[PDB]
Amino acid sequence: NATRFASVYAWNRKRISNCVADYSVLYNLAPFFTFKCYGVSPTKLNDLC
Amino acid sequence: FTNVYADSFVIRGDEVRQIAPGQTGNIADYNYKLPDDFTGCVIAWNSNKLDSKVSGNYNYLYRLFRKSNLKPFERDISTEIYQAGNKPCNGVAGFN
Known part of the structure; x- marks a missing residue:
């Protein structure tokens, strides 16, 4: 969100x-262009520590 | 033994480590599971000098996404688009 x-x-x-990051509002909206990576799904990151 | 069931499939070399009983992965959950009472063997062979392509091989496709955990020894032929939200997909990709 930085200018x-x-x-x-x-x-x-x-x-x-040492904080709690909320990515669940980003994945249910998605202004993000393209997600491409290997071996770890970015949609599965919500329950992971 | 009584009978043998051969399953012919092609998995890339990063994802071959999830083939074992009791794993967790992309193929190991929503595609192909091995139960704890499964009995048999795994045979693999290197197809990279034959079946590859310079522009990429689009003849085979694989499923990343499913609504729930798939039961083993079952094929998924369903063409239905996964709907994350309350917006209808109408057969194509889009919002949620």
Whole structure:
């Protein structure tokens, strides 16, 4: 949801630890362009710790 | 033994580790299950020098998604689109 960004080489790393992240409102809406990855389904990430 | 049932299928080499009794995976849940009382053997062979294609082989397809857990030794011929939400799909992909 951030307005600003970074370039390809200069990218910042935001560490996500010790918090509860809600991805269930993103998957039931999906403005996201294309999800492609291997071996782990992104729709199965809701019950995983 | 009495009889033998041969199941001919092609699985990529990342997903062959889920073929064993009592696994969990994409193929190991919604496609092909092995129960704990299953008895038999697994035979595999490398088809990459024959059955592959440069632009990709679209002749075979596989199911990622199902509403519930599939019972083993059962084939799924259903062309029905998985509906996540309350919006009707009308046979095509779309919102939910």
